[PDB]
Amino acid sequence: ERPTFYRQELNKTIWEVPERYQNLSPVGAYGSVCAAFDTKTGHRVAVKKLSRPFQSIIHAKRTYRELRLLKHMKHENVIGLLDVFTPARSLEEFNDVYLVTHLMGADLNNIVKCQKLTDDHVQFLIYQILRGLKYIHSADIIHRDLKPSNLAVNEDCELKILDFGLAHTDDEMTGYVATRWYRAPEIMLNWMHYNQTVDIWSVGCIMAELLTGRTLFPGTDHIDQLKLILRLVGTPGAELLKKISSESARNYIQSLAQMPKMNFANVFIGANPLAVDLLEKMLVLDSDKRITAAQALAHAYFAQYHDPDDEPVADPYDQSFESRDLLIDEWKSLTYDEVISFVPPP
């Protein structure tokens, strides 16, 4: 049952992996990554060795969360898990976890670097993001970190979502940084309990950038970015103000002079009118009123790609562990069980 493993030191790290994985070559604070050839499947793969997976309760729970999420995702537009392994022969000697995925090449940044695309390409790329999001959201999973560097794209314009948000620090979100430019305002400023609607805001920011070739809200800090957002979509009325928990945040918003929603046809000059209409439905300040992924797939902008018989939902996903309090060794045992029960895809 257990494959034979072989050891080797590559760039200060000891790697112990099954013989099927050959010609390892380093490529990249959560772990180290090597490219390899998988002789069992013929795929070029990424092998990630997790760093200190069980060093604290918070870190042990995060390791379990990542493995549970990756084992669930089975969709053409979402990254999936090809393999997971440990060299340990028992729970008592279990310390290291390795994750194997398809090796990804270019991301959406490269396809879009200072450059804008034709309308048919925008339709196909955004269609695939929304198809993957319908699947993710149907399992009550929120990505939280959608942005161009987290979207893999090949030469045939085919797209996969990767790098789910596993719960980024304060410093990573400070200043003139792409890590914040795609985030919905309610999460950027901690206005309220957020939900899956945050991902639709991010899609609107991505779609705008594909149409213009430029970042939509390139703020120099949180407040500068909020000002750019409210200039486009308008300042909020009392209905949304009542939904913001912090009195300080409400006071700050009301200190700003009121502004109307702008004409999106005069911002996205020359865009397909159906693209303008869809952007107006995604980039809505009140998250309760944003279009959902399932609704957006039926919008006329996607008429040439929409097939309601080929837009699947996910199997139900059990997240009850998120509210559970366990010790390090208990999270470690749960992770071990998930490693040993893995069944590879066809």
Ligand X SMILES: Cc1ccc(N2C(=O)C=CC2=O)cc1C#N
Shortest Cβ distance from residue 150 to Mg ion (Å)? 5
Active site residues: 163
Q: Which residues bind Mg ion (CB under 5 A)?
A: 150, 163
**Binding segment for ligand X among 47-55, 100-108, 211-219, 311-319 (CB under 6 A)?**
211-219
From the list Cl ion, ligand X, Mg ion, none, pick the one residue 212 interacts with, judged by a Cβ distance below 5 to 8 Å according to partner type: ligand X
Shortest Cβ distance from residue 278 to ligand X (Å)? 13
**Binding segment for Cl ion among 27-35, 118-126, 172-180, 193-201 (CB under 5 A)?**
172-180
Query: Which of 236, 281, 242 is CA-nearest to residue 255?
Result: 236
Q: Which of 149, 235, 272, 292 binds Cl ion (CB under 5 A)?
A: 149
Query: Which of 79, 77, 97, 78 is CA-nearest to residue 87?
Result: 97
In terms of CB distance, is 40 or 289 closer to Cl ion? 40
**Binding segment for ligand X among 44-52, 187-195, 207-215, 287-295 (CB under 6 A)?**
207-215
Would you give the end-to-end CA distance of the chain in angstroms?
18
From the list Mg ion, Cl ion, ligand X, none, pick the one residue 74 interacts with, judged by a Cβ distance below 5 to 8 Å according to partner type: none
Helix residue ranges per DSSP H, the chain = 57-72, 108-112, 119-138, 178-181, 185-188, 197-212, 222-233, 238-241, 247-254, 273-282, 293-297, 328-340
In terms of CB distance, is 209 or 331 closer to Mg ion? 209
Contact in structure between 124 and 157 (CB atoms under 8 Å): yes
In terms of CB distance, is 260 or 270 closer to ligand X? 270
Q: For residue 148, state whether it binds Cl ion (rule: CB under 5 A).
A: yes
Q: Does 48 show up as a binding residue in the annotation?
A: yes
Residue type at position 178: A
Shortest Cβ distance from residue 276 to ligand X (Å)? 8
Residue 92, token pair as written in the block: 């008592």
Q: Which of 27, 178, 303, 327 binds Cl ion (CB under 5 A)?
A: 178
Query: Which of 278, 272, 270 is CA-nearest to residue 121?
Result: 272
Shortest Cβ distance from residue 209 to ligand X (Å)? 10
Angle between helices 119-138 and 197-212 (to 10 degrees): 170
In terms of CB distance, is 73 or 275 closer to ligand X? 275
* Burial (CB count <10 Å: 0-12, 13-18, 19+), residue 311: middle
Please state, in angstroms and rounded to a whole number, the distance separating the CA atoms of residues 332 and 64.
8
Binding site for ligand X (CB under 6 A): 116, 211-214, 268-271
